[PDB]
């Protein structure tokens, strides 16, 4: 459960990455598609080549949704209710994939903003990503 401490840490780090939503979002998806190839099966319609406009556009949308969740961090389930039906009902994304994506995300911030990803922030950020994952699979969990 997200504490006052976690809410603060998460907002802290997201201030630093809000500026590069597209960039970080694209890198996150590429590292995901590369280290966990099985995830590519959800994007048969996408051009999965490194640098593709589709991945940059989608990566952008993904981080935006994350930002939206930070701002309504007290009721993440309500802020993302539409994404929840999409992922759980329509897309049927296997819940294990949300951890892959979340992990790749932590990796890109570790790479671009190491000093900000302290042990404690890492923990807060891990709780947050797990919360989002729970909500987007919420329908069938």
């Amino acid at each position: 459960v997200l504490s006052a401490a976690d809410k603060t840490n998460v907002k802290g780090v997201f201030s630093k990455i809000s500026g590069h939503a597209e960039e970080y979002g694209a890198e996150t998806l590429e590292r995901m598609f590369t280290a966990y190839p099985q995830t590519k099966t959800y994007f048969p319609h996408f051009d999965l080549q490194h640098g593709s406009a589709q991945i940059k556009a989608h990566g952008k949308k993904v981080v935006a949704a994350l930002v939206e969740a930070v701002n309504h961090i007290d009721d993440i389930a309500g802020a993302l209710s539409k994404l929840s039906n999409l992922h759980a009902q329509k897309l049927r994304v296997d819940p294990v994939n949300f951890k892959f994506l979340g992990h790749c995300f932590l990796v890109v911030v570790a790479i671009h903003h190491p000093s900000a990803l302290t042990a404690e922030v890492h923990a807060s950020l891990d709780k947050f990503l797990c919360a989002v994952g729970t909500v987007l699979t919420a329908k069938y969990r």
């Binding site: 890198e27 590369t34 990796v107 790479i111 042990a119 891990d126």
Partner: protein
């Protein structure tokens, strides 16, 4: 179980720049902090009541070095991994009863710890190779059940 020539150079080249002591201590400290229940296994390390206490604890720091050294043995015996971890498998499975899922979590902490230490040098192709290495080591430890 098969390593491409490209993967070996990728993990090997990187290992040489690894500060085994700092990364070892940082990775272990992070496991005890982001996954709190793992502290149950390290009761003999003394004070682990706060993130600070954990990051400052010398035993945590020292054990961390040993774990990462253990990963180095794997990097040098990329094909002889089963034997290399055979006795560690018995310790963790039969004496400690650590659930294999935790090996997977430690491997991920290690991945993000290396990313923060190498930055952009830790390319997606590089991460993929290390993710594989970490899964193999985890699999070689989760053998006593198999």
């Amino acid at each position: 179980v098969h390593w491409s020539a490209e993967e070996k150079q990728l993990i090997t080249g990187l290992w040489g720049k690894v500060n085994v002591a700092d990364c070892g201590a940082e990775a272990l400290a992070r496991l005890l902090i982001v996954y709190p229940w793992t502290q149950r296994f390290f009761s003999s390390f003394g004070n682990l009541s706060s993130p600070t206490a954990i990051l400052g604890n010398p035993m945590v720091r020292a054990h961390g070095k040993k774990v990462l050294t253990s990963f180095g043995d794997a990097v040098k015996n990329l094909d002889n991994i089963k034997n290399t971890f055979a006795q560690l498998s018995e310790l963790h499975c039969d004496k400690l009863h650590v659930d294999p899922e935790n090996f997977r979590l430690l491997g991920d902490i290690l991945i993000i710890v290396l990313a923060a230490h190498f930055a952009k040098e830790f390319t997606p192709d590089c991460q993929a190779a290390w993710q594989k290495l970490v899964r193999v080591v985890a699999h070689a430890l989760a053998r006593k059940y198999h």
